[PDB]
């Protein structure tokens, strides 16, 4: 009755009202890339470390 | 025990009233000397409705007493050793209080039932005749007793109709609707 009443109206008369996925980018975090692979880059390489560590520290063993 | 209690002071009184007058058996007799005594009362506005103020004295009461059973001679006799008690225990002032609650007492002795029809506005006399048709043939209405329905006008019951008696409802309403209706969509 009231109920039937209540019912046409409020899917009839009115819906949905505007709201557009772009204004939404602006509420979330969006992606962005991973930048850097962050290659590792060779340290110690030759026996100039080995010339460097024989003389530096001559403290033998006890 | 009397069919219909009455809670509280002043209805203490009716129901020992009703009781008494039922052992006499003469309960008819009582209630139609009652309207009588309250009607002459109520009859006779100034001065001796508005002298029924708390502040005359035990000899003043016992003398508004006196002159209340000059009044008419016609009176059941227990109404006339209630005008006493009521004069003696100095609860006269609460006159009209103890009529009326015999009366509801009574008329439950009698068989009626009063209901209700609450509604926005006046209701039609065709509506007025359907639900009583209605009600009266309900189980609800046991029959064997009798329904004075009243439609009072309620602005604050938007629409519809509730019905009342027995202090049981039935409440379809546009108001009550639209309140749980309302309630469920802003879930």
Known sequence: ?62 | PPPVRLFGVEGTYATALYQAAAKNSSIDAAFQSLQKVESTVKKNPKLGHLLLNPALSLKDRNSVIDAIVETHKNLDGYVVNLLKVLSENNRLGCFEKIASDFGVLNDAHNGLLKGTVTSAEPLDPKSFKRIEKALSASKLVGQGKSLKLENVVKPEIKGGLIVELGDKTVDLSISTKIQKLNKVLED
């Open chain 1, 1 to 62: 009755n009231v109920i039937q009443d209540l019912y046409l109206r409020e899917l009839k008369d009115t819906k949905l009202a505007p709201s557009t996925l772009q204004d939404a980018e602006g509420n979330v975090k969006p992606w962005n890339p991973p930048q850097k692979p962050n290659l590792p880059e060779l340290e110690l390489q030759g026996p100039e470390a080995l010339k460097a560590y024989t003389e530096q520290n001559v403290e033998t063993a006890h």
